[PDB]
Amino acid sequence: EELLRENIELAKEHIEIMREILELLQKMEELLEKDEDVAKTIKELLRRLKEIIERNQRIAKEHEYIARERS
Amino acid sequence: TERKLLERSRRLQEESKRLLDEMAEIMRRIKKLLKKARGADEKVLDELRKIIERIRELLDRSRKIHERSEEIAY
């Protein structure tokens, strides 16, 4: 129960991280807008990155639920 | 299906591990590409420098989460 309780907290933290990271990536886009080839490659990278975070964001929630159920 | 939950969680963490590696490498890629971008404003480029290393740190910490979570699950 101690570990399961820890699992819940750990998962929650991860979700928070992904939230902040998602916020930071958005801030990065603002500055990117503020070389065409370089910026183009960047824009795609953050686009691809964004998608990655969302999926991982879903996983974090999914795990948190698992941890909740596992208790 | 209690064992189902353990198996389910274990699979997800494997996937999530894959994601953080892919993300970290992307961020690394960005830092290199940014430095190659002398054309942009130096101050703004630095800001992204500070921002990215903030993110990179969080991904390191996230990796520590997984490492820990894997211990608990194991």
CB contact under 8 A, B33 and A45: yes
- HSE-up of residue B48 (Cα within 13 Å, Cβ side): 26
- HSE-up of residue B72 (Cα within 13 Å, Cβ side): 22
Q: Which of B59, B38, B30 is nearest to A56 (CA)?
A: B59
Q: A11 to chain B, minimum CA–CA distance in Å?
A: 8
Secondary structure letter of residue B1 according to DSSP: -
Straight-line distance from the first to the last Cα atom of chain B, in angstroms, rounded to the nearest whole number: 18
- CB distance B10 to A54 below 8 Å: no
Cα gap B22→B20, rounded to integer Å: 5
Q: Give me the amino acid identity at A58.
A: R
Angle, helices B42-73 vs A2-33, to 10°: value is 160
Q: Which of A9, A26, A55, A24 is nearest to B20 (CA)?
A: A55
What residues does each domain of chain A span? 1-71
Domain count, chain B: 1
